[PDB]
TrEMBL record, chain A:
<feature type="binding site">
    <location>
        <position position="184"/>
    </location>
    <ligand>
        <name>Zn(2+)</name>
    </ligand>
</feature>
<feature type="binding site">
    <location>
        <position position="65"/>
    </location>
    <ligand>
        <name>ATP</name>
    </ligand>
</feature>
<keyword id="KW-0548">Nucleotidyltransferase</keyword>
<dbReference type="GO" id="GO:0061605">
    <property type="term" value="F:molybdopterin-synthase adenylyltransferase activity"/>
</dbReference>
<keyword id="KW-0511">Multifunctional enzyme</keyword>
<dbReference type="GO" id="GO:0005829">
    <property type="term" value="C:cytosol"/>
</dbReference>
<dbReference type="GO" id="GO:0005524">
    <property type="term" value="F:ATP binding"/>
</dbReference>
<keyword id="KW-0963">Cytoplasm</keyword>
<keyword id="KW-0808">Transferase</keyword>
<keyword id="KW-0833">Ubl conjugation pathway</keyword>
<dbReference type="GO" id="GO:0046872">
    <property type="term" value="F:metal ion binding"/>
</dbReference>
<comment type="function">
    <text>Plays a central role in 2-thiolation of mcm(5)S(2)U at tRNA wobble positions of cytosolic tRNA(Lys), tRNA(Glu) and tRNA(Gln). Also essential during biosynthesis of the molybdenum cofactor. Acts by mediating the C-terminal thiocarboxylation of sulfur carriers urm1 and mocs2a. Its N-terminus first activates urm1 and mocs2a as acyl-adenylates (-COAMP), then the persulfide sulfur on the catalytic cysteine is transferred to urm1 and mocs2a to form thiocarboxylation (-COSH) of their C-terminus.</text>
</comment>
<dbReference type="GO" id="GO:0061604">
    <property type="term" value="F:molybdopterin-synthase sulfurtransferase activity"/>
</dbReference>
<keyword id="KW-0862">Zinc</keyword>
<dbReference type="GO" id="GO:0002143">
    <property type="term" value="P:tRNA wobble position uridine thiolation"/>
</dbReference>
<feature type="binding site">
    <location>
        <begin position="72"/>
        <end position="76"/>
    </location>
    <ligand>
        <name>ATP</name>
    </ligand>
</feature>
<feature type="binding site">
    <location>
        <position position="89"/>
    </location>
    <ligand>
        <name>ATP</name>
    </ligand>
</feature>
């Protein structure tokens, strides 16, 4: 699955328009096709992210969700259909992804992600996208990504706005603080309109593609630092504010620069006591926020 | 004909969208009574239509004459592999019906041309330019100016895409005696693709269309009043999304440039314009890359708490004045060092009293180029302050920048000084 060294005749035609982009090419396309991307959440954030990773040809796409399609969510979950109401979101979404592009392998997880199964779900994947829109789950996914060394693309709905940030990319082992390292979600922190959540989801796919094509999740050359222009060690917190009574303004998008890994972070900092065994056993406890 | 109430089925489908502040039943009925035209059923048109269909726009028109091809599915995610060979408009409506069967979908199984542009556009309320074609983009803007239509235009290229709201609220051709929104010529005088880039701009197009309909941003202001500058209509924003495969989201990935209003000498909307609907039909404007540099970027009107502090720490803002418009007792709890307090309450009264000497509202100045920075509690009233100061010619014809701090003193606390004593 990750061993492709050639493109078939159908793949050349299907991906011809995007391979010609500078910085993509054949090497860029094979990196997508040999990649494994996990999408946690098949709703407003997960549907647009999945659609554009499917069209682009990511070779393996996992989707985690245990909920069902509902009529009142179609205005924002546009990958679903009215006739698929009552069906599992993961199955309804993959039905549309297969329509877009049947060449990738789609791996459904037909159940909720929890502290007891997070590590099992996340471990096999190269890049993690948090599309849960659940604050408690966000901390769980960040923690597990730190412990299993995974880059995390996390987005959320908050008030009348959306958010996006790339975390732990390139991943750095827990507790290492004698070098520049990317932050985790804890390092940074402590009714929704369709276009808002849709824009963050599309942005999430754009970032996952960036990481895989340019190998932004790979370490730098020995003794070399990660270029600050890559916006990885100190990532940007993107905040898009959407107000129904005001057309797009000069600061509807805010790009807040984040700090690097904190030395005293509960999860990734020095002397961290967070462990995979603890998470499984309820330590820490992810209280509903 | 106008629908005035909701059924049980519509309340279910739209319940979680109507609770959004500013939407409600009134906002929903405005969408369901609206008619939106989407020209182009491809990379930009698919996401735009998906989210307008889901939101419940009552009537959605789609113009396209091309067919679905395998090589474009990577960015045209509303189409299906099984529907390769079908007309794009027929393929797209099939998907839109699946999302939401309640709207009325109107296909135009042909391409827009100078000969049919006016006929196609006239019946529709809001126009979305989802063509990635320069020639068609100029043609649509021209027709929208002549027919008095608001236009949401987008474009995409290898590394970037753009979005801008034009001629909203619409103002007749040739009117130059008042503030008026620009057209595409006012903004850009004539000289591969990644899915996420075009998808981003397409979703943003639907977002703007929804805002225009729900808040009736395309309706004129009250007689004698100008459109609120805070609505970003008469001087719209040019959004630019730069997608660099070798760099994650950065400070300039999303760049929003403020545009000037209508140009007095615009070929299409300016005074003494020779452009007419019959001239377009006759080929008199000959609509010969996809994205070009703008030609009416306006001077900046706002600054972030972060940027203002960044310049203050490096001593960049020389000779400037900092006006704190919070009320007296609020200013007494603390302020930015060097801020002069000019309460907003008294400011509005003194400004009301200059309907007679010159500019006593303000305090001791220096030069003609000395910037003025306004800051209030949370950036709600500071734009109005800046707007009236310019109304009284205190920008000296544009040589003196007058800005406000985005988010007021709350943003100052959140972005710069977390221990600031904010009330
Ligand atoms: Zn951390
Ligand atoms: Zn013009």
């Amino acid at each position: 699955g990750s061993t492709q060294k050639s493109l078939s005749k159908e793949e050349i035609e299907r991906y011809s328009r995007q391979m010609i982009v500078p910085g993509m090419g054949k090497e860029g396309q094979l990196r997508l096709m040999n990649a494994k991307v996990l999408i946690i959440g098949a709703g407003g954030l997960g549907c647009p992210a999945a659609q554009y990773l499917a069209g682009a040809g990511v070779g393996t796409i996992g989707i985690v969700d245990g909920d069902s399609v509902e009529t009142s969510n179609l205005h924002r979950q546009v990958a679903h259909a009215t006739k698929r109401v009552g069906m599992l979101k993961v199955d309804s979404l993959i039905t549309h992804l297969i329509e877009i592009n049947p060449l990738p392998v789609y791996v459904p997880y037909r159940f909720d992600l929890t502290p007891q199964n997070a590590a099992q779900i996340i471990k096999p994947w190269d890049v993690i996208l948090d599309c849960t829109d659940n604050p408690a789950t966000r901390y769980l996914i960040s923690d597990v990504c730190v412990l299993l060394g995974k880059p995390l693309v996390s987005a959320a709905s908050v008030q009348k706005s959306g958010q996006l940030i790339v975390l732990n990319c390139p991943p750095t082992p827990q507790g290492v603080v004698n070098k520049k390292a990317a932050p985790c979600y804890r390092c940074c922190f402590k009714g929704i309109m369709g276009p808002v959540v849709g824009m963050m989801g599309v942005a999430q796919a754009g970032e996952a593609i960036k990481i895989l094509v340019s190998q932004l999740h790979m370490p730098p050359k020995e003794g070399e630092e990660v270029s600050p222009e890559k916006n990885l060690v100190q990532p940007t917190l993107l905040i898009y504010t959407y107000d129904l009574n005001s057309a797009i303004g000069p600061y509807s998008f805010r790009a807040l620069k984040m700090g690097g890994r904190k030395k005293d972070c509960f999860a990734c900092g020095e002397n961290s006591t967070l462990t995979l065994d603890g998470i499984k056993s309820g330590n820490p406890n992810y209280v509903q926020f | 004909s106008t629908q005035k109430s909701l059924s049980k089925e519509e309340i279910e489908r739209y319940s979680r969208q109507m609770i959004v502040p500013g939407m409600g039943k009134e906002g929903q009925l405005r969408l369901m009574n609206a008619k939106v035209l989407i020209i182009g059923a491809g990379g930009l048109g698919c996401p735009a239509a998906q989210y307008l269909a889901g939101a419940g726009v009552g009537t959605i028109g789609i113009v396209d004459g091309d067919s679905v091809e395998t090589s474009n599915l990577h960015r045209q995610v509303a189409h299906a592999t099984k529907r390769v060979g079908m007309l794009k408009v027929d393929s797209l409506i099939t998907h839109l019906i699946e999302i939401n069967p309640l709207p009325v979908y109107v296909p135009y199984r042909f391409d827009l041309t100078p000969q049919n542009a006016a006929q196609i556009i006239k019946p529709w309320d809001v126009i979305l330019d989802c063509t990635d074609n320069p020639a068609t983009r100029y043609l649509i803007s021209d027709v929208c100016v002549l027919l008095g239509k608001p236009l949401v235009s987008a474009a995409s290229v290898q590394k970037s895409g753009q979005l801008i709201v034009l001629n909203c609220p619409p103002t007749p051709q040739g009117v130059v005696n008042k503030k008026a929104a620009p057209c595409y010529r006012c903004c850009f005088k004539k000289p591969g693709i990644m899915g996420p880039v075009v998808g981003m701009m397409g979703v943003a197009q639907a977002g703007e269309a929804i805002k225009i309909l729900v808040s009736q941003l395309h309706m004129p202001p009250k007689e004698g009043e100008e459109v609120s500058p805070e609505k970003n209509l008469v001087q719209p924003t040019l959004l630019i999304y730069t997608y660099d495969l070798n760099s994650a989201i950065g400070p300039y990935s999303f760049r929003a440039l403020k545009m000037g209003g209508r140009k007095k000498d615009c070929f299409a909307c300016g005074e003494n314009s020779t452009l007419t609907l019959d001239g377009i039909k006759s080929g008199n404007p000959n609509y010969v890359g996809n994205m070009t540099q703008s030609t009416n970027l306006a001077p900046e009107d706002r600054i972030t708490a972060t940027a203002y502090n960044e310049k203050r720490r490096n001593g960049e803002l020389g000779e400037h004045i900092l006006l704190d418009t919070r009320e007296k007792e609020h200013f007494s709890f603390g302020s930015i060092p060097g801020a002069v307090n000019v309460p907003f309450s008294k400011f509005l009264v003194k400004a009301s009293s200059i309907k007679r000497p010159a500019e006593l509202l303000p305090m001791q100045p220096a030069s003609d180029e000395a910037p003025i920075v306004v800051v209030c509690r949370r950036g709600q009233d500071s734009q109005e302050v800046v707007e009236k100061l310019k109304e009284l010619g205190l920008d000296n014809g544009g040589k003196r920048k007058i800005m406000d701090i985005v988010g007021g003193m709350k943003a100052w606390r959140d972005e710069v000084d977390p221990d600031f004593p904010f009330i």
